[PDB]
């Protein structure tokens, strides 16, 4: 059960106050422009992006130059969430699905109200998280090197910029302490298991993103329960029901554990009772592309967890967002499963 063909990709949520740079960070990693396409420049839905470990290794190379950091995960599913205050339901849903998280804090503003909301969500579930202390390019006089590691860029800054960085860092540390979190600049953290690491980033220049990606792998590998590194019983959650061209009424699903297969008999909650149907198409986006954006879909015979998938199947009208989804196995009674899922 701990075999290479049984590794699980964990789930990381991004959380943070409105406009702190959650989507912009993911756009820099993906090399996409989702944020520019958003109405109002604000995220209004949960979005999912799968990052294969190959891509993570490449995007952390500048802080792993000798190639010796050991990557154990096969990849990571990252769930983007709204910061706008009206979407607390979606932050709660995203937080409930993740195994680890990134909390984005604008270094220029510190902790803000939806930061405090997000901290309550993280606290409640004992979720391991790192803080992306974002927007460092706004420190006055910041000199960038695109996609550099933070420490190498920080060493090239003038004294005023270094002073300003430390002043803002010390303020944010105090704010975290007021909320009951002891936090450390990531390379000053001597207790990774119990203290929150602060990793300075810019989504505009890419600086510090290599450090942030390395740290979330370290969260998976060193803080997340080790059992969650491997696949066990299926767990899946409906995010949305949506009509799309050619496929009809589909569901978007976060596959949290186990394996889904084309043709599977699935059961889930509907407005009038359980829905029982068969997967006609099991779809994902391309790697490093979003689920919440229309694009061309990849069809799979099999999808291993975690992933964001789109399922086409008859009868999904009235599927309920937040519903669990189960697969009828050989030893299952299809009617008995209907009752379990609700």
Ligand X SMILES: Nc1nc2c(ncn2[C@@H]2O[C@H](COP(=O)(O)OP(=O)(O)OP(=O)(O)O)[C@@H](O)[C@H]2O)c(=O)[nH]1
43 binds Mg ion (CB under 5 A): yes
Q: Which tokens hold the place of 75? A: 């990849």
Q: State in Å, rounded, how far the first CA of the chain is from the last one.
A: 29
Q: Which residue's C-beta sits nearest to ligand X?
A: 83
135 binds Mg ion (CB under 5 A): no
118 binds Mg ion (CB under 5 A): no
Measured from the CB atom, the residue of 40 and 67 that comes closer to ligand X is 40
Measured from the CB atom, the residue of 43 and 153 that comes closer to Mg ion is 43
For residues 340 and 266, what is the distance between their CA atoms, to the nearest angstrom? 12
Measured from the CB atom, the residue of 77 and 139 that comes closer to ligand X is 139
**Mode of pairing for the β-strands spanning 248-257 and 259-261:** unpaired
- Find the helix or strand (DSSP H, E) in which 15 lies: strand 11-16
19 binds Na ion (CB under 5 A): yes
Give how many residues touch ligand X by CB under 6 A: 23
314 binds ligand X (CB under 6 A): no
Give how many residues touch Mg ion by CB under 5 A: 3
**Cα-trace Rg, the chain:** 20
Nearest approach, Cβ of residue 204 and Na ion (Å): 14
189 binds Mg ion (CB under 5 A): no
Name which of residues 16 to 35 contact Mg ion (CB under 5 A). Answer: 22-23
Nearest approach, Cβ of residue 55 and ligand X (Å): 20
Segment near ligand X (CB under 6 A); pick from 51-59, 141-149, 202-210, 301-309: 202-210
309: partner contacted, choices Mg ion, ligand X, Na ion, none (Cβ within 5-8 A by kind): none
Whether the CB-CB separation of 340 and 326 falls below 8 Å is answered with yes
For residues 132 and 16, what is the distance between their CA atoms, to the nearest angstrom? 9
327 binds Na ion (CB under 5 A): no
Whether the CB-CB separation of 283 and 306 falls below 8 Å is answered with no
- List Cα–Cα distances, 36 to 33, 78, 120, 123, 238, in angstroms: 6, 19, 30, 32, 27
Whether the CB-CB separation of 63 and 149 falls below 8 Å is answered with yes
Residue 148 gets which letter from DSSP? -
30: partner contacted, choices ligand X, Na ion, Mg ion, none (Cβ within 5-8 A by kind): none
Whether the CB-CB separation of 303 and 282 falls below 8 Å is answered with yes
Name which of residues 20 to 49 contact ligand X (CB under 6 A). Answer: 20-24, 35, 41-43
Measured from the CB atom, the residue of 202 and 312 that comes closer to ligand X is 202
Using a 10 angstrom Cβ sphere, with 0-12 exposed, 13-18 middle and 19 or more buried, the burial of residue 4 is exposed
Segment near Na ion (CB under 5 A); pick from 13-21, 128-136, 313-321, 331-339: 13-21
42 binds Na ion (CB under 5 A): yes
Name the residues that contact Mg ion, by CB under 5 A: 22-23, 43
């Amino acid at each position: 059960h701990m075999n290479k063909d049984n590794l699980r990709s964990p789930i990381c949520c991004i959380l943070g106050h409105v406009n702190t740079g959650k989507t912009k960070l993911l756009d820099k990693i993906r090399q996409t422009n989702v944020q520019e396409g958003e109405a109002g420049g604000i995220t209004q839905q949960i979005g999912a992006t799968y990052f294969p470990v190959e891509a993570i290794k490449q995007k952390t190379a500048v802080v792993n130059k000798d190639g010796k950091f050991e990557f154990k995960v096969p990849g990571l599913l990252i769930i983007d969430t709204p910061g706008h205050e009206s979407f607390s339901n979606l932050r709660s849903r995203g937080s409930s699905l993740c195994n680890i998280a990134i909390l984005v804090v604008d270094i220029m503003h510190g902790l803000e109200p939806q930061t405090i909301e997000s901290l309550r969500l993280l606290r409640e579930r004992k979720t391991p998280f790192v803080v992306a202390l974002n927007k460092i390019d706004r420190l006055y006089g910041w000199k960038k090197i695109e996609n550099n590691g933070f420490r190498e860029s920080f060493a090239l800054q003038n004294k005023a910029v270094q002073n300003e960085f430390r002043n803002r860092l010390d303020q944010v540390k105090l704010q975290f302490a007021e909320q009951g979190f002891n936090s450390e600049l990531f390379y000053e953290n001597k207790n990774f298991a119990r203290y929150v690491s602060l990793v300075p980033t810019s989504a505009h220049t890419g600086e510090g993103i290599p450090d942030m990606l390395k740290l979330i792998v370290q969260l998976c590998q060193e803080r997340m329960a080790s059992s969650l590194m491997y696949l066990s019983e299926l767990q899946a959650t409906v995010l949305e029901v949506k009509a799309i061209e050619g496929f009809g009424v589909t569901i978007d699903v976060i596959l949290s554990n186990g394996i889904l297969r084309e043709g599977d008999r699935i059961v889930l909650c509907g407005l009038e009772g359980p829905i029982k149907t068969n997967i006609r198409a099991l779809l994902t986006p391309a790697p490093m592309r979003e689920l919440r954006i229309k694009g061309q879909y990849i069809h799979h015979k099999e999808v291993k967890a975690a992933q964001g998938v789109k399922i086409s199947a008859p009868g999904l009208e009235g599927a309920i967002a937040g519903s669990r989804l189960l697969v009828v196995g050989p030893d299952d009674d299809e009617e008995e499963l209907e009752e379990e899922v609700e």
